């Protein structure tokens, strides 16, 4: 039930005594780095391409009297490609296609030569690649590549065969980014919440004491920093991300802490638990660390403009004549 | 409610820093004794020939109930009519010392310090209790004021002066907004401690640390246990709130916007935070006991009665 502090969940009770510091060019720089991380024309072409043409292709096999007909239910788009937070250098986007029947290996490699031969007859000067994989399979082009998350039916769950079928864990991962897809789209689909979440996920890749934080979390971290707030108003993104940085070391992924729920399960999930206490007591003195380079002006290392900046998390560092001695682990056993 | 270890441990520190009842019942006793003298000299001004001092406050550490094992000091704030001056200094201290055998055989130590604008009273135990007399006038806080832009040569000094309303200030927003919070004034009592024992906490003690606690326990949504509400204050630190850009902590108390927080240098926010962030931690993975430098283990408002002699009008 604990609730740990939040600066913007109660501004009123701190009034600023000079005015706020100017940060034109921490802003600034947030959105050149945007500009950097932002996947580029072409590769937005390509996987809008690969994604469109095997989504038909899927579509059309669900009613088209068949094998397959009598094997898929739906077929949804999730992952960054949906939400907007992909990553130039990462053109893979996800597609989660629930089977009416029991999910075996054998069903999803015939599912996957089928859509890459529908593609291949359509257009056989492309070349494309389909593997299988433990999760479903993928198909890649040349520029971009776009995965398949298996599934089936609620129903079909409580009757599965560890010896036959997919495991549980796989087949309930891609119900579950159905539903965060389509959370995110009625929640989060807003432009600061979608820069915000593309350079959280730069962040994490920069910083390993940032490692154990999962993709999911990071969407309802950047959506909590952005909207979650009295005016309900969307935050700055400058002002968004660095309370990014002030909740984590305020322990809002601490042991006692109610952190974030799972608006996406039952009934009222901590998001962090998934995380090892050793992780949480990490992933809080990593961002407290961070909080700390920030109110020295480090805000181009912490963005990745300045080369390496990992050992700013492990190593002692002078920020104009302030010594700063990273925070230490506590979690002990 | 929860986090009931950390509520025990708290609270088994917070006795260890609470003062004996013989600490009390002299500061009681010393303090009711300037008390009954000041009025009497009061009166005995008053009949020269015929007010000029307005009344006697309890400031600091004893109006607001923060007295800890060890505390030495006590103080009172005497309100003069007009600016005080040199020669009322020594009439008051003159005369503090007759009317003190009215109330009282206990012997006490009067010197007067033109200095500090005050009188310091000094019993005969061991260690004895020292209690300071300021003397002041709202007179000096308006003139100040109005310099903004819009008498006798031995006034004062008015720094001194202007300090000792803003103690008054101060007591009056301690038990108006800070005495009435659930778990404030022990969590107060108990980081005082800290304070005292890790120099790095040291530039927080008094007026900064009040605020501090207020604020982050006041914003709480619900009331909060000792431990809770403790966590809740290590947690404010935790996010930088008293690092340089920050917002800094807004003083109450001031006409013009101030920093309760805008003397300490850049090293020591970042000392301060840095510990705080470690202590956050500890905490959370069930260490506090080591944050309160004790073995983990295996009505609290009032430390003494509201004055009698001079009486003040006494959270929502
Ligand atoms: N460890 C996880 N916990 C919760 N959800 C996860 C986890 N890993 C993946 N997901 C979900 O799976 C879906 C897609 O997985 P993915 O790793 O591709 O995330 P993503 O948003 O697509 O990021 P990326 O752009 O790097 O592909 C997402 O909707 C996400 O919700
Ligand atoms: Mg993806």
Redesign the pocket.
């Given at each position: 039930s604990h609730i740990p502090f939040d600066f913007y969940l109660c501004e009123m009770a701190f009034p600023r005594v000079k005015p706020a510091p100017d940060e034109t060019s921490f802003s600034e720089a947030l959105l050149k780095r945007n500009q950097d991380l932002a996947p580029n024309s072409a590769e937005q072409a390509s996987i809008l391409s690969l994604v469109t043409k095997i989504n038909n292709v899927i579509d059309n096999l669900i009613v088209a009297p068949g094998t397959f007909e009598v094997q898929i239910e739906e077929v949804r788009q999730?992952?960054?490609?949906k939400?907007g937070?992909?990553?130039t250098g990462?053109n893979?986007a996800?597609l989660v296609v629930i089977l009416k029947i029991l999910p075996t290996l054998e069903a999803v490699a015939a599912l996957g030569n089928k859509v890459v031969e529908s593609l291949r007859a359509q257009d056989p000067s492309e070349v494309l690649t389909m593997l299988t994989n433990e999760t479903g399979f993928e198909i890649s082009s040349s520029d971009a590549t776009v995965?398949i998350l298996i599934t089936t039916v609620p129903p079909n769950l409580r009757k599965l065969d560890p010896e036959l079928h997919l495991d549980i864990k796989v087949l309930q991962?891609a119900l579950?980014?159905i539903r965060?897809?389509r959370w995110?789209e009625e929640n989060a689909s807003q432009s600061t919440v979608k820069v915000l979440i593309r350079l959280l996920?730069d962040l994490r890749i920069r910083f390993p004491g940032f490692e154990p934080l999962?993709?999911?979390?990071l969407?309802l971290l950047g959506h909590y920093a952005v909207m979650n707030n009295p005016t309900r108003q969307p935050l700055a993104l400058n002002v968004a991300y660095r309370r990014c940085l002030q909740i984590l070391a305020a322990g809002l992924f601490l042991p006692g802490s109610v952190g974030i729920t799972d608006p996406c399960e039952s009934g009222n999930f901590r998001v962090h638990t998934?995380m090892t206490l050793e992780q949480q007591d990490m992933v809080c003195y990593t961002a407290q660390t961070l909080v700390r380079i920030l109110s020295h002006g480090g805000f181009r290392k912490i963005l990745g403009q300045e080369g390496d900046a990992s050992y700013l998390a492990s190593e002692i560092s002078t920020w104009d004549g302030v010594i700063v001695t990273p925070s230490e682990k506590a979690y002990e056993k | 409610r929860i986090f009931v270890n950390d509520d025990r441990h708290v609270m088994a520190k917070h006795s260890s820093v609470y003062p004996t009842q013989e600490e009390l019942e002299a500061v009681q006793n010393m303090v009711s004794h300037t008390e009954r003298a000041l009025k009497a000299v009061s009166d005995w001004i008053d009949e020269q020939e015929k007010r000029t001092l307005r009344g006697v406050m309890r400031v600091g550490l004893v109006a607001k109930g923060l007295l800890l094992k060890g505390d030495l000091d006590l103080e009172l704030v005497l309100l003069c009519k007009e600016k005080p001056t040199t020669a009322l200094l020594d009439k008051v201290a003159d005369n503090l010392a007759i009317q003190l055998t009215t109330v009282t055989e206990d012997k006490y130590e009067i010197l007067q310090s033109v200095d500090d604008a005050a009188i310091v009273i000094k019993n005969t135990k061991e260690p004895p209790l020292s209690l300071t007399i300021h003397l002041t006038s709202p007179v000096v806080r308006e003139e100040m004021e109005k310099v903004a832009g819009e008498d006798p040569p031995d006034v004062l000094d008015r720094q001194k002066c202007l300090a000792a309303l803003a103690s008054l200030r101060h007591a009056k927003w301690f038990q108006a907004r800070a005495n009435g919070l659930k778990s404030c004034v022990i969590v107060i009592r108990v980081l005082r401690d800290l304070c005292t024992r890790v120099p790095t906490w040291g530039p927080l003690r008094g007026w900064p640390l009040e605020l501090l606690c207020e604020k982050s326990i006041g914003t709480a949504n619900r009331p909060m246990g000792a431990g809770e509400a403790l966590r809740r204050v290590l947690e404010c630190l935790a996010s930088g709130i008293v690092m340089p850009d920050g917002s800094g902590i807004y003083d109450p108390c001031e006409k013009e916007a101030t920093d309760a927080i805008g003397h300490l240098d850049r090293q020591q926010r970042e000392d301060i935070t840095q510990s705080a962030q470690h202590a956050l931690r500890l905490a959370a993975f069930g260490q506090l006991h080591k944050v309160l430098g004790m073995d983990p283990l295996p009505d609290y408002t009032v430390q003494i009665p509201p004055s009698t002699t001079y009486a003040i009008t006494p959270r929502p």
């Amino acid at each position: 039930s604990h609730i740990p502090f939040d600066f913007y969940l109660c501004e009123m009770a701190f009034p600023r005594v000079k005015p706020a510091p100017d940060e034109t060019s921490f802003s600034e720089a947030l959105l050149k780095r945007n500009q950097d991380l932002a996947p580029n024309s072409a590769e937005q072409a390509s996987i809008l391409s690969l994604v469109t043409k095997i989504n038909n292709v899927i579509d059309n096999l669900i009613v088209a009297p068949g094998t397959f007909e009598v094997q898929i239910e739906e077929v949804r788009q999730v992952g960054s490609y949906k939400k907007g937070t992909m990553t130039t250098g990462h053109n893979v986007a996800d597609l989660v296609v629930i089977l009416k029947i029991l999910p075996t290996l054998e069903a999803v490699a015939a599912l996957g030569n089928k859509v890459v031969e529908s593609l291949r007859a359509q257009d056989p000067s492309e070349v494309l690649t389909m593997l299988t994989n433990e999760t479903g399979f993928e198909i890649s082009s040349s520029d971009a590549t776009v995965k398949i998350l298996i599934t089936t039916v609620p129903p079909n769950l409580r009757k599965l065969d560890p010896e036959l079928h997919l495991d549980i864990k796989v087949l309930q991962s891609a119900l579950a980014a159905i539903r965060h897809a389509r959370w995110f789209e009625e929640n989060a689909s807003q432009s600061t919440v979608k820069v915000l979440i593309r350079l959280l996920k730069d962040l994490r890749i920069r910083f390993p004491g940032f490692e154990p934080l999962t993709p999911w979390i990071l969407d309802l971290l950047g959506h909590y920093a952005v909207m979650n707030n009295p005016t309900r108003q969307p935050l700055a993104l400058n002002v968004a991300y660095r309370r990014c940085l002030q909740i984590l070391a305020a322990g809002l992924f601490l042991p006692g802490s109610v952190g974030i729920t799972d608006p996406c399960e039952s009934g009222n999930f901590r998001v962090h638990t998934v995380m090892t206490l050793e992780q949480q007591d990490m992933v809080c003195y990593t961002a407290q660390t961070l909080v700390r380079i920030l109110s020295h002006g480090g805000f181009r290392k912490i963005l990745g403009q300045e080369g390496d900046a990992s050992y700013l998390a492990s190593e002692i560092s002078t920020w104009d004549g302030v010594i700063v001695t990273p925070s230490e682990k506590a979690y002990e056993k | 409610r929860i986090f009931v270890n950390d509520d025990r441990h708290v609270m088994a520190k917070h006795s260890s820093v609470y003062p004996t009842q013989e600490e009390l019942e002299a500061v009681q006793n010393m303090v009711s004794h300037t008390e009954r003298a000041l009025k009497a000299v009061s009166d005995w001004i008053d009949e020269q020939e015929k007010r000029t001092l307005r009344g006697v406050m309890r400031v600091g550490l004893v109006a607001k109930g923060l007295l800890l094992k060890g505390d030495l000091d006590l103080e009172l704030v005497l309100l003069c009519k007009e600016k005080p001056t040199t020669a009322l200094l020594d009439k008051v201290a003159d005369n503090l010392a007759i009317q003190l055998t009215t109330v009282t055989e206990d012997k006490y130590e009067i010197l007067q310090s033109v200095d500090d604008a005050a009188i310091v009273i000094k019993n005969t135990k061991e260690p004895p209790l020292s209690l300071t007399i300021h003397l002041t006038s709202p007179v000096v806080r308006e003139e100040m004021e109005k310099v903004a832009g819009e008498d006798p040569p031995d006034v004062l000094d008015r720094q001194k002066c202007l300090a000792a309303l803003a103690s008054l200030r101060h007591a009056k927003w301690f038990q108006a907004r800070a005495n009435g919070l659930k778990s404030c004034v022990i969590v107060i009592r108990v980081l005082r401690d800290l304070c005292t024992r890790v120099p790095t906490w040291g530039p927080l003690r008094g007026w900064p640390l009040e605020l501090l606690c207020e604020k982050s326990i006041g914003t709480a949504n619900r009331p909060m246990g000792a431990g809770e509400a403790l966590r809740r204050v290590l947690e404010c630190l935790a996010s930088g709130i008293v690092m340089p850009d920050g917002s800094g902590i807004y003083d109450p108390c001031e006409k013009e916007a101030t920093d309760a927080i805008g003397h300490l240098d850049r090293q020591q926010r970042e000392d301060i935070t840095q510990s705080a962030q470690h202590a956050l931690r500890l905490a959370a993975f069930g260490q506090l006991h080591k944050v309160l430098g004790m073995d983990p283990l295996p009505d609290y408002t009032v430390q003494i009665p509201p004055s009698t002699t001079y009486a003040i009008t006494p959270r929502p």
